[PDB]
Amino acid sequence: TDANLQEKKIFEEKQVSIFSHLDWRRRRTTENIPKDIHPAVIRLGLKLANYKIFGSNQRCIDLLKTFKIVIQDYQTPYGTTLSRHLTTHINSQIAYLVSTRPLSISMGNAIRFLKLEISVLDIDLTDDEGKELLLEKIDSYIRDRIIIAGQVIVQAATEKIQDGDVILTYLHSSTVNDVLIHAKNVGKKFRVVVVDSRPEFEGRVCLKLLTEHGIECTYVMISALSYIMQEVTKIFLGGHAMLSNGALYSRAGTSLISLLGHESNVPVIACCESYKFTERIQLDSLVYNELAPGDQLVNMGVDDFEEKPGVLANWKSVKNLKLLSLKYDVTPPRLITVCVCEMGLLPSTSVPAIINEFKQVYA
Amino acid sequence: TDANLQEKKIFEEKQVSIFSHLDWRRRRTTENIPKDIHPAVIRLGLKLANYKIFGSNQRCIDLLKTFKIVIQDYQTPYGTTLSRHLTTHINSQIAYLVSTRPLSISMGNAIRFLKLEISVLDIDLTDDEGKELLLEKIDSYIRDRIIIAGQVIVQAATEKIQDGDVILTYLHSSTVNDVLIHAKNVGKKFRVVVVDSRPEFEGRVCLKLLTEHGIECTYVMISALSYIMQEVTKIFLGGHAMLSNGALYSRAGTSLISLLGHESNVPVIACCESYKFTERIQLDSLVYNELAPGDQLVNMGVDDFEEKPGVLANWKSVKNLKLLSLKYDVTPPRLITVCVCEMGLLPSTSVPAIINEFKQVYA
Amino acid sequence: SGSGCLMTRTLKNACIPTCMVLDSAVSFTMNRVDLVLVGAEGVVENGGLINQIGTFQLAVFAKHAHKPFYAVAESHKFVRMFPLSQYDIPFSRPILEFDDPSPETVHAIHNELIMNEEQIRNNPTLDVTPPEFVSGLITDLGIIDSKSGVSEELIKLYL
Amino acid sequence: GPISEFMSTINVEHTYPAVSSLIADLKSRKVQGPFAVAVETALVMRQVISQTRWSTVDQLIDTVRAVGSTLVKAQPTEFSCGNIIRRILRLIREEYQELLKTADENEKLGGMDMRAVIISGIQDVIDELDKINTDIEVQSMDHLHSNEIILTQGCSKTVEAFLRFAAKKRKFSVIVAEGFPNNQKGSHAMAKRLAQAGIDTTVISDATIFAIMSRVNKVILGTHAILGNGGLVTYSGAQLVAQAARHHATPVVVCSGIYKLSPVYPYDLESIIQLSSPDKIMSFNEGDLISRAEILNPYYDYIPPDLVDLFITNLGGYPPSYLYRIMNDTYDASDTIL
Amino acid sequence: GPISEFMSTINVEHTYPAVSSLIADLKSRKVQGPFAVAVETALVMRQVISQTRWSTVDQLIDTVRAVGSTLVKAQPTEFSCGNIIRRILRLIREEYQELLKTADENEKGGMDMRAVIISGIQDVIDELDKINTDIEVQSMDHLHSNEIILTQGCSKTVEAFLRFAAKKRKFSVIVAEGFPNNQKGSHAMAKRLAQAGIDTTVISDATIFAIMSRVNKVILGTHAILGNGGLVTYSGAQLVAQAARHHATPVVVCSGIYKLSPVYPYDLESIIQLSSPDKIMSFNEGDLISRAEILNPYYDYIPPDLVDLFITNLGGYPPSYLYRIMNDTYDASDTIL
């Protein structure tokens, strides 16, 4: 690329706008693509930028079982051995795989794990030797950290549900959906509240899923929160990641949900999985975030961009007027009453210890 | 004043710095004063910029006592009666005075009052008839509005003092001193805490006064508030003005006193006088305020006049470096427990109604 | 429980000044206190507190009156329970139920018109202090203020 | 005491035609919003006074104090209606008592044809309303300052003209949370207008409020009405702004007219908030859903008065603990209920 | 159990001369500050181990567990000393235990681990001359351009913290001269970073509330941290804390970890020392100094529930995680000396 130039503009993008630093640059096409790139990565790469309702957790899976194929189809050159070169190959994958959409925390941590096990294997094992354990090491990483922990959480989460509750979710969290779905099958008596928001109404698909199991549900937009919260008794939240201070990191309205719940004295239950935890720490919801294109706001009506001649459609060419839409915010711990990880129901502030319970397992 | 394109220069003084708008322009010397300036006004204008400890009350008094001399020495241009022309003369006195120090609230309200009585004055009188009248009105103002109100506040103030108390004042409020000395003269058994602060340690003179009446007094700078407040049981503050929202407007360190007092459960008592109430309001202590030259804190050490220099003597010519010192800051009303006006003990939020009692049932 | 009188004597019996306070007027006394100290009848995961009813009644005052709050707990009182709110705790009998007044007709130190044993039973015997109000939790393991180390030490107990 | 007991149905339509004509448009929401209600509610009574027969004065107040009870029974939530009425009741009894004393001014010891002044008194308040935005926007320069970051919601025209005034001389930035789903259209228009006014305006989703409040100086708001307790009956999604602002120690500022002030007390909110059609929320097409779920869409939010920090009025800026004094100087406690 | 109950003063002065020398310089403030206390403490203990005769490790434990109790009796408030000690004690018992296990290979004398302990001590020394470098890095993950920072009283750790970010990003900072004690140093700091191209604004120690309205973050460098996460900071720092809490402005602390200590703040009146009143009132007002009560606190205390994030030579962590550093850095027995 332009190299330091395009890497100096970024550090010039530091001025008045409190979003001057948020990386807007994307690649939604395979135009001018490099050749160091495996096909299945590209499909995944196009999946990220174009899928909308996807990837609270499914990315890490879809990334890993894709990674297997990469290493499977990989073969080391005759000169150097395997571990001396594999990372550089994978490093060239993620670089592309970033310009499609910035990494999640669930993905980033897994990558940080994979690069480790690469550097620790013994050289005696040959290619067909070295590959075979990685898949198991990966297939285990999937079953141990993701799926099982899910089933553990779903059990533990459904545990503290009581017959007669009225519980509230917000924008289709595949984890929390599995909870309510599991809750119905055990015969728990309750009903659910679904809060949707603009732009891409990620919540209606949760309405579909829940209704296809016969669940008394209620669909109201976020701006009506002050109303419906009186009905609610419990609040469940599936997060993108939890922070070292104990803050919950999820999509835009995740804060207001926790806020009014507190000021209405209902609990905020954060269902998140352990590997999503991060030693990262941030105070305001603007230091580290990820942007969605503001064009999607032009859609005035209740559908994805289609027959929506918004009066803003020319904002890209109207000075002093620029739209935006974060898709992640930072909710402080004072509102979160509890996080439920496969290590059990823990106080959100108890996160960073759990991370330290891994560096012991890993040397 | 080249013109009021220098006021356009003020319109350019709205830049990044929070204090860009705060007026720094002063005239602390009689260089090139205009002709139409009364001598006894000059002395005051000099007293303004150079005096310290200039109590907000005494200024209003010394202003009025000076104003009488202006009118008493005033003679209208005959053929044009008094009321038609008096204001512009006086209006040319204020415009000078403000260039020595911006008008206190204790003065501006008096200004807006006298200018009123000028307009309402009966034309069918003559000069020696007219000027003699408002002199009594001025004297009546000083009798009713301040001295009596002062004499009422103190009595009502010391009423709520209890034997065994520990009083805390800060930076010499002539009213606050006036009530403290009364407390000793009625045999009230107590002791006083005196908080001082940089730069011009206005609190020493409060210590001087109280000591010359023999009171168990305690002198500590404000950066020890966390310590001393445990001993304190009541707090008394004399304000520069009280806002219609209920906020108290006094010297820069007034807020932390009330804050630390609240978080230590001591009451905050605002002894202020009615004529120092204002219809305006402030959310930040920066929008409406007045400054002091930053040089005055260059002198490190315990003295002010004494030529003990510092490491910042070049700050005027060191870019990205600037010293400042606001003289006043607001104080949110929820920290003020009571305000002591001559209308009695009132909650600070009841201020704006009292102002209406003046606007209404009068003219 | 009326356990105050027992606590009163046992202190007075050890030559220290006492002054009983009815549970209705603790707040009026807070400004006079310098420290608040209560026992523990049970400790949950989140740092909460299970003690005799009215324990939370105090800690809110100490909070609002800006006075510290300490609770003494022995290690063997920790429990795996994790109540969400300040209410969801397993309780035997039904609690705080009402009546059904059909249309009929059945009929300052007033010291003898007190709630009968029956209607007293309808009251709960335990309240719960959330961890935000426990400035300090003292145990045989030491003093624990984190209310996350409460859990780490807890996990260290349940093998 | 509604009029239906005093006067029947058809007779009202013959002597007071616009009344029953209005009530139709008032329940059918042909006329809605506070301003549009007030102006119409006024000139209706103009014709009423211009076409009524009466002798004394207690009978006259008993008439207007009766039609209003119905005229507010149509759509009570639009408090702008009754507010015009309660002020009118004082307008005559202040006029009556004022002229009752010019009689005994020198009298040594009738009651009609004072309509034109009452009409002129009525006509006055109408001229005041077309002024309301004008004598409010001038208060902006006492607060808004350059480089400051502002957040508002919806499309309150009063708040619009408020900012644009400062925008002419000083330049700064604002943040527009679209009042989804109801205040959507107007919000976008306002933002586009704010741009041409030279404001670094940024349109955000309704849910991005908490994210940017961390670096927001002040928040400005324009309600739909203010109740007796100082509570705000505002368009949808405002409690999000308030709670997020308070949680960030951000000062809340309300720039409302005074006619939207009403002393009715918020006994129960469930009888206050209204709900438009769910069409504004979920498309009619998703037929499986609308049958299997309960869908609601309100456009009224309520915020308790202990949240706001300042009101901007055509009279001036005043703290919430002072609104009562405006009431007794504008209404009469006899006319609280109707 | 002080050393006097184990060795006599002359013997202490003979075999361990630098100890009594340091004890003198301690109670007399010849040495001062947390850092300078720490470095000199270990250097003393280095020579101690370098010049001592013993056999068992249990007796060696009892020795260091005694001098410290005496060394901490000198000027306890400078907790930096005792923190170094308890670190060594664990550094022994775990080094002993790790060497008690290699010898248990199949055997189923026991000393002269000297130079290792010295090599372990030197590892502590070289670790300290580094905290700033280890801390000034995490800046770029918080401070951004056009941000507004408030900070009081010439904390060296905080200085290099900002100056690092100021090399690449440009932003503003408000400095409140920690009057009266931190006066001189604070002005120097302001003057220093002023040259580092960062908008510097020196204020009175009292205008804190006025500007907190438009302050993004606040940053503080303490003198010590106690077992409950409380902060023992230099004079006049509770204001800015309480000023921040009232404005929802977050509070961050950039401190090395050696200042952390598990002493529990039972009574603060036994913690906050008091310096000379000369620093706030001249000797001249003889009428006043005889007629009133003058006090000048050296330190200030803020409770942990006001801190929002810590910055350490290890990383950023919330206060609730602090304990898990102590158990990973100290041993529970060595809380009380």
UniProtKB/Swiss-Prot annotation, chains A, B:
Compartments where found: Cytoplasm, Cytosol
Predominant cellular place of this UniProt entry's protein: cytoplasm
Keyword Lyase: no
Keywords, comma-separated and alphabetical: Cytoplasm, Initiation factor, Phosphoprotein, Protein biosynthesis
Cellular component annotations (GO), alphabetically ordered: cytosol; eukaryotic translation initiation factor 2B complex
A single BP term in Gene Ontology: cytoplasmic translational initiation
Molecular-function GO term, any one: guanyl-nucleotide exchange factor activity
Keyword Glycosyltransferase: no
Physiological role: Acts as a component of the translation initiation factor 2B (eIF2B) complex, which catalyzes the exchange of GDP for GTP on the eukaryotic initiation factor 2 (eIF2) complex gamma subunit. Its guanine nucleotide exchange factor activity is repressed when bound to eIF2 complex phosphorylated on the alpha subunit, thereby limiting the amount of methionyl-initiator methionine tRNA available to the ribosome and consequently global translation is repressed.
Family of this protein: Belongs to the eIF-2B alpha/beta/delta subunits family.
Quaternary data: Component of the translation initiation factor 2B (eIF2B) complex which is a heterodecamer of two sets of five different subunits: alpha, beta, gamma, delta and epsilon. Subunits alpha, beta and delta comprise a regulatory subcomplex and subunits epsilon and gamma comprise a catalytic subcomplex. Within the complex, the hexameric regulatory complex resides at the center, with the two heterodimeric catalytic subcomplexes bound on opposite sides.
Protein known as: Translation initiation factor eIF2B subunit delta
From Swiss-Prot, chain C:
Stated consequence of mutating residue 82 to V: Decreases the amount of gcn3 in the eIF2B complex
Taxonomy, superkingdom: Eukaryota
Cellular compartments annotated: Cytoplasm, Cytosol
Consequence the record notes for mutating residue 26 to F: Decreases the amount of gcn3 in the eIF2B complex
Quaternary structure and partners: Component of the translation initiation factor 2B (eIF2B) complex which is a heterodecamer of two sets of five different subunits: alpha, beta, gamma, delta and epsilon. Subunits alpha, beta and delta comprise a regulatory subcomplex and subunits epsilon and gamma comprise a catalytic subcomplex. Within the complex, the hexameric regulatory complex resides at the center, with the two heterodimeric catalytic subcomplexes bound on opposite sides.
Homology family: Belongs to the eIF-2B alpha/beta/delta subunits family.
Role description: Acts as a component of the translation initiation factor 2B (eIF2B) complex, which catalyzes the exchange of GDP for GTP on the eukaryotic initiation factor 2 (eIF2) complex gamma subunit. Its guanine nucleotide exchange factor activity is repressed when bound to eIF2 complex phosphorylated on the alpha subunit, thereby limiting the amount of methionyl-initiator methionine tRNA available to the ribosome and consequently global translation is repressed.
Name the UniProt record assigns to this protein: Translation initiation factor eIF2B subunit alpha
Naturally occurring in which organism (per UniProt): Schizosaccharomyces pombe (strain 972 / ATCC 24843) (Fission yeast)
Gene assigned in the entry: gcn3
UniProtKB/Swiss-Prot annotation, chain E:
Localization of this protein: Cytoplasm, Cytosol
GO molecular function terms noted in the UniProt entry: guanyl-nucleotide exchange factor activity; translation initiation factor activity
Presence of keyword Protein biosynthesis: yes
This protein's GO CC annotations: cytosol; eukaryotic translation initiation factor 2B complex
Any Gene Ontology biological process: regulation of translation
Keywords, alphabetical: Cytoplasm, Initiation factor, Phosphoprotein, Protein biosynthesis, Translation regulation
InterPro entries, A to Z: eIF2B_beta_subunit, IF-2B-related, IF_2B-like_C, M1Pi_N, NagB/RpiA_transferase-like
Complex and partners: Component of the translation initiation factor 2B (eIF2B) complex which is a heterodecamer of two sets of five different subunits: alpha, beta, gamma, delta and epsilon. Subunits alpha, beta and delta comprise a regulatory subcomplex and subunits epsilon and gamma comprise a catalytic subcomplex. Within the complex, the hexameric regulatory complex resides at the center, with the two heterodimeric catalytic subcomplexes bound on opposite sides.
Entry's family note: Belongs to the eIF-2B alpha/beta/delta subunits family.
Name listed for the protein in its UniProt record: Translation initiation factor eIF2B subunit beta
Source species of the chain: Schizosaccharomyces pombe (strain 972 / ATCC 24843) (Fission yeast)
The organism's taxonomic lineage, starting at the top: Eukaryota, Fungi, Dikarya, Ascomycota, Taphrinomycotina
Gene: tif222
